[PDB]
Structure 1
Amino acid sequence: GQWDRLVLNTPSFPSNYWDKFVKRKVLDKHGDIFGRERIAELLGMDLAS
């Protein structure tokens, strides 16, 4: 569990797996409650970009 925190900010997290929008779905699910910008920083993605 501690080791899995390394790929959260990487831009190649959904590699070697069918889905590539998992970060987008996580953002759309948890942003309204835990802070959209906070989740964006946690997942290493830019909503403006």
Structure 2
Amino acid sequence: GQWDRLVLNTPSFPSNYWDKFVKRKVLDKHGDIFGRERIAELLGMDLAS
């Protein structure tokens, strides 16, 4: 897990996977319990707004 922290902010993280919307999945699922500006900075979603 500790080595895989560096992949949470590349834009081509799921790029060798069939699902590409897993960023919006956990954002729209957990963006209300925490600050959705924080978890977007955890994921690096550019132009999230």
- TM over 0.5, yes or no? yes
| Range with greater deviation from structure 2 (27-36 or 38-47) | 38-47
Equivalences, count: 49
TM-align CA RMSD:
1.4
After the TM superposition, list the runs of 4 or more consecutive aligned residues in structure 1 that deviate by more than 4 angstroms: none
Q: Is the 8 A contact 2:40 2:48 kept in 1?
A: no
**CA distance, structure 2, for counterparts of residue 42 and residue 27 of structure 1:** 10
| Range with greater deviation from structure 2 (38-47 or 28-37) | 38-47
Unaligned stretches of 5+ residues in structure 1: none
Deviation at 1:35, TM superposition (A): 1.0
Deviation at 1:46, TM superposition (A): 3.3
- Relative to total residues, which structure has the larger helix share, 1 or 2? 1
TM-score (ref. length: structure 2) = 0.88
**CA distance, structure 1, for counterparts of residue 46 and residue 26 of structure 2:** 14
Q: Is the 8 A contact 1:11 1:44 kept in 2?
A: yes
Unaligned stretches of 5+ residues in structure 2: none
In the alignment, which residue of structure 1 is the partner of 2:24?
24
